Amino acid sequence: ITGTSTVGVGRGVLGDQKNINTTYSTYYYLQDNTRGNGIFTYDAKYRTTLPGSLWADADNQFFASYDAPAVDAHYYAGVTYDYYKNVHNRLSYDGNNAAIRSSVHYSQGYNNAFWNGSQMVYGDGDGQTFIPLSGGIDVVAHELTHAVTDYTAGLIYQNESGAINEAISDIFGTLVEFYANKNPDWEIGEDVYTPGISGDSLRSMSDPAKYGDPDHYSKRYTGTQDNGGVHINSGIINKAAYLISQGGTHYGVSVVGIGRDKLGKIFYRALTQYLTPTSNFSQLRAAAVQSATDLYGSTSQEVASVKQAFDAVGVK
Ligand SMILES: O[C@@H]1[C@@H](O)[C@H](O)OC[C@H]1O
Numbered sequence: 001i002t003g004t005s006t007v008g009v010g011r012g013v014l015g016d017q018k019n020i021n022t023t024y025s026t027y028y029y030l031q032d033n034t035r036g037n038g039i040f041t042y043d044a045k046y047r048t049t050l051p052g053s054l055w056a057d058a059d060n061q062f063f064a065s066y067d068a069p070a071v072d073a074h075y076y077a078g079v080t081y082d083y084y085k086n087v088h089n090r091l092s093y094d095g096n097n098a099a100i101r102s103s104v105h106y107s108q109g110y111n112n113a114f115w116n117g118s119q120m121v122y123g124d125g126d127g128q129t130f131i132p133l134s135g136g137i138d139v140v141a142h143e144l145t146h147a148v149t150d151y152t153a154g155l156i157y158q159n160e161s162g163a164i165n166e167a168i169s170d171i172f173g174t175l176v177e178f179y180a181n182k183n184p185d186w187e188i189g190e191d192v193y194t195p196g197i198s199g200d201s202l203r204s205m206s207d208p209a210k211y212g213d214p215d216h217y218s219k220r221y222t223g224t225q226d227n228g229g230v231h232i233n234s235g236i237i238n239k240a241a242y243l244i245s246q247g248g249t250h251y252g253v254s255v256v257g258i259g260r261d262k263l264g265k266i267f268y269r270a271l272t273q274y275l276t277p278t279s280n281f282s283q284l285r286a287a288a289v290q291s292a293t294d295l296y297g298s299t300s301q302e303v304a305s306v307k308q309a310f311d312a313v314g315v316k
Pocket residue numbers: 001002003004005023033038
């Protein structure tokens with residue numbers, strides 16, 4: 001809509017206050033004109049028609065329970081935009097400042113959130129398995145990173161390529177969570193998963209085995225469920241990424257940690273320059289090594305640590 005750029009205030013799913021960029025024309029709309037071609041957040045009104053109505057509010061105050069998923073979808077889309085622009089010089093998910101559109105209150109009791117090829121879609125959860133999923137910045141950034149992948153390498157969504165696709169989204173979801181630096185960790189979805197249970201998450205990058213996911217290539221899932229285990233086998237790559245950043249000794253292999261920023265630069269360059277739709281784990285290792293070589297030199301600690309981490313998870 002056409003209007004004046006304003007700044008509202010509200011509370012997110014977890015009860016935290018934040019400012020949101022809005023547009024004023026009779027109503028205040030969740031339309032952020034400060035980022036690219038805009039960030040737009042919509043009310044799906046418990047239906048499955050998309051996108052729904054551009055979110056309209058009478059007073060630019062967003063403290064109602066019903067407002068909270070929209071506040072967070074809108075704000076965390078902005079954080080994700082800021083991460084990719086400030087850290088990687090990437091303008092929105094397509095690198096050409098595409099508008100970021102999000103719909104909340106999608107369906108009823110819907111325990112999922114997804115990038116659908118042109119927008120984000122957030123269920124409210126059933127209140128037991130999940131609370132509204134836009135409350136998780138790593139979920140928001142994980143899903144927006146699928147769009148980044150779609151517009152670059154084009155990794156399919158099955159078998160090893162699909163597990164890489166998933167891991168890339170977990171890696172940058174986590175790096176966005178650290179970039180926002182409110183309550184970061186190496187877990188996925190902890191803020192919105194199982195409100196009755198503290199200390200759990202959907203999966204752990206630091207210790208995938210905590211939830212039964214593999215932390216070594218020899219433990220990879222080879223069945224047909226989950227498109228060949230894309231959310232399971234991602235643990236092998238997630239563990240490698242965790243090791244590259246934080247270091248550690250894993251199955252007897254010592255990894256010197258190089259920190260989060262270099263992890264992100266290495267994997268971002270691998271994704272955008274070297275991966276292809278059918279890249280497998282071994283080809284991801286090669287891409288990460290070449291990326292670290294480009295950025296830091298063949299004799300660098302960064303290259304050596306990439307090799308150590310992939311050795312530690314059994315990917316040659
Ligand atoms: O409403 C306006 C928006 O549509 C435009 O894109 O940039 C400025 C805004 O105030």
